Ligand binder design. Structure first.
Ligand code: NA
Ligand code: NA
Ligand code: NA
Ligand code: NA
Ligand code: NA
Ligand code: NA
Ligand code: NA
Ligand code: NA
Ligand code: NA
Ligand code: NA
Ligand code: NA
Ligand code: NA
Ligand code: NA
Ligand code: NA
Ligand code: NA
Ligand code: NA
Ligand code: NA
Ligand code: NA
Ligand code: NA
Ligand code: NA
Ligand code: NA
Ligand code: NA
Ligand code: NA
Ligand code: NA
Ligand code: NA
Ligand code: NA
Ligand code: NA
Ligand code: NA
Lengths: 241, 9, 98, 9, 241, 98
């Protein structure tokens, strides 16, 4: 059906259809939520979550892929106490993809081992991963997820159940999925840079009952390039198609 | 290897 | 800094010292050291489902000590309990993991 | 400024 | 004492085998890397890691064994200025067991002491076997990670996420382990040639801060003896089973 | 004939006469004298979780030493430290420490 920019007389464009926003857990998106549990391994979640979410998006396949197969061995990351996102999926274009759910759980890392050439089934990736802040102005013009970074002012996990505005943490501490952007109202202006009703929905790896029931809305501009919290620094898009 | 006929469940 | 990790150590302010006293209740029913109260002068903090503190406390003849706890997430009272025991480990183990 | 800069007439 | 005269016989004796890439670390068997730190003790890590490995590769019950019930309990080895995995193995086959890592802690270069009756843990070996220089791409595959020794250059100590294309030491004065091997499809820096370079996955007793998680990778090929630093001269392994 | 340890002695490179110069920066532990840096003689080396370059030196009324110095691993900043030092020895009696 015919949804958006269509020349009808004389002028045209370049797939620049709205310059507006709607959220992408509602229009084909999102996978379930998960608890991190005396382990800080959020790289794992965001990273392997993007593989699984791009599955449910690109193909209507719906894989609820595991997290203790890059946190039982990614011998290029430094444990449940370390790991990056700069290269947290580049260890699944060499592993065959990570082994999956309903035949393997996450188990909190009481000092443990790998079980990787044990399974008959695997689901992995083909393409690479890097979203520039020059693709986070249209952020989800892919119709699919992103793996940006968030710093926490520790006035973050404060179960605001809502929105947070402010100058965030100090270093890109935690890893956060991008479940989309929302657009509530547009600027209600002040002397300079007035009230932001516009919002940014982002999933998290902390818990399932936290804020917007596992998610956190924050405060973007018309575009997405004038926030704080340093989001747009480490964005990556793991694809298989 | 263990591919179709070998695996248990 | 590291997603899931941290950066260097920060100057010991009294709030990690209150986390200290909660750790010491836990520490004495299964530690040979019939324990008590200590003195905290180093730490590091992490981004977990919680805040995964480490407490450098001084003890013993001339060795020093180290521990782990987490200010839980603001579910209910943040009622921190353990997640690590490495007793009388020196001030020079680079703030360890237990 | 160039995401759909339809400048001119 | 004993050797590959009647021991390999059952595994890759009566049977021949084959592979190009087999790591006992992505295979539910190897245990954590740790440190030595200014005390002349590199041998302790190799031995205790070795016994951890085989218990978990056989009856898959993990142990973290201790290197302070060794370094100061040496009865025939030297101590915190040097030591010999050949005989640290055997000092263990006269005691009765090695304390678990956290049933007897570790200090650094600082003058501590030794007790063996602060344990009831009987984590021991019935005997051990001696592994030749030549068979070391098939010694870490059926018989387990062999507690090798290496050389030290001042190039060696500097790591990154790559294979060693640098020079080496002026003598073989160190002790490490060998876990496995593999093959990696690559390009030519000048061509578009099908260059496939082989490696050796070894552990280390330097920090788990090291790029590939206390697993540093050096030059060896399908021959088994392209060693650029002499990886396999001292390489014997213990026999819990 | 040992895997992992010390190695029998060696004459000299002046880039372990850079670590001898750092002796005065890493003293005022128990030094007790006025010697405003010690002058070196011979060389020795160890290879552990760092390059623990060994070196000896001189003093006031000509009594030498056998130290247990330590450089850094490829880690954090420029630190050179003192592990174990001693004095009141002869030039023929050489470097030790266990
Ligand atoms: Na299915
Ligand atoms: Na790359
Ligand atoms: Na395969
Ligand atoms: Na605060
Ligand atoms: Na609107
Ligand atoms: Na301004
Ligand atoms: Na940037
Ligand atoms: Na069967
Ligand atoms: Na407080
Ligand atoms: Na007890
Ligand atoms: Na008392
Ligand atoms: Na506990
Ligand atoms: Na105009
Ligand atoms: Na016209
Ligand atoms: Na013989
Ligand atoms: Na026999
Ligand atoms: Na005996
Ligand atoms: Na060199
Ligand atoms: Na060098
Ligand atoms: Na670097
Ligand atoms: Na060359
Ligand atoms: Na050529
Ligand atoms: Na050339
Ligand atoms: Na000689
Ligand atoms: Na020079
Ligand atoms: Na000078
Ligand atoms: Na005199
Ligand atoms: Na001694």
């Amino acid at each position: 059906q015919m949804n958006y920019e269509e020349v009808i007389k004389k002028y045209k464009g370049n797939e620049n259809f709205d310059h507006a926003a709607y959220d992408w857990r509602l229009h084909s998106g999102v996978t379930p939520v998960k608890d991190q549990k005396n382990c800080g391994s959020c790289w794992a979640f965001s990273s392997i979550g993007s593989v699984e979410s791009q599955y449910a998006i690109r193909k209507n396949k719906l894989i609820t892929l595991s997290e203790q197969e890059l946190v039982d061995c990614s011998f290029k990351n430094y444990g449940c106490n370390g790991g990056l996102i700069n290269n947290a999926f580049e260890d699944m274009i060499e592993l065959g993809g990570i082994c999956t759910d309903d035949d393997y759980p996450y188990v909190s890392d009481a000092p443990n081992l790998c079980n990787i050439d044990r399974c008959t089934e695997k689901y992995g990736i083909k393409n690479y991963l890097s979203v520039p802040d020059n693709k986070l102005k249209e952020a989800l013009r892919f119709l699919g997820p992103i793996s940006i970074s968030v710093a926490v002012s520790d006035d973050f996990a404060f179960y605001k159940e809502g929105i947070f505005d402010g100058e965030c943490g100090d270093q890109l501490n935690h890893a956060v999925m991008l479940v989309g952007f929302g657009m509530k109202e547009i600027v209600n202006p002040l002397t300079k840079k007035g009230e932001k009703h516009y919002y940014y929905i982002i999933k998290n790896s902390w818990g399932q009952q936290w804020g917007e029931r596992g998610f956190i809305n924050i405060e973007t501009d018309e575009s997405g390039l004038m926030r704080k919290c340093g989001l747009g620094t480490d964005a990556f898009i793991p694809l298989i198609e | 290897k263990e591919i179709v006929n070998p695996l248990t469940k | 800094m590291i997603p899931g990790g941290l950066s260097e150590a920060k100057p010991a302010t009294p709030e990690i010292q209150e986390i200290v006293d909660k750790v010491k209740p836990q520490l004495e029913e299964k530690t040979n050291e019939t324990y008590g109260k200590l003195e905290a002068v180093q730490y590091k903090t992490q981004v977990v489902a919680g805040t995964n503190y480490y407490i450098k406390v001084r003890a013993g003849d001339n060795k020093y000590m180290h521990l782990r706890v987490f200010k839980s997430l603001p579910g209910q009272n943040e009622d921190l309990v353990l997640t690590g025991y490495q007793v009388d480990k020196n001030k020079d183990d680079e703030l360890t993991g237990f | 400024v160039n995401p759909l800069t339809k400048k001119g007439e």
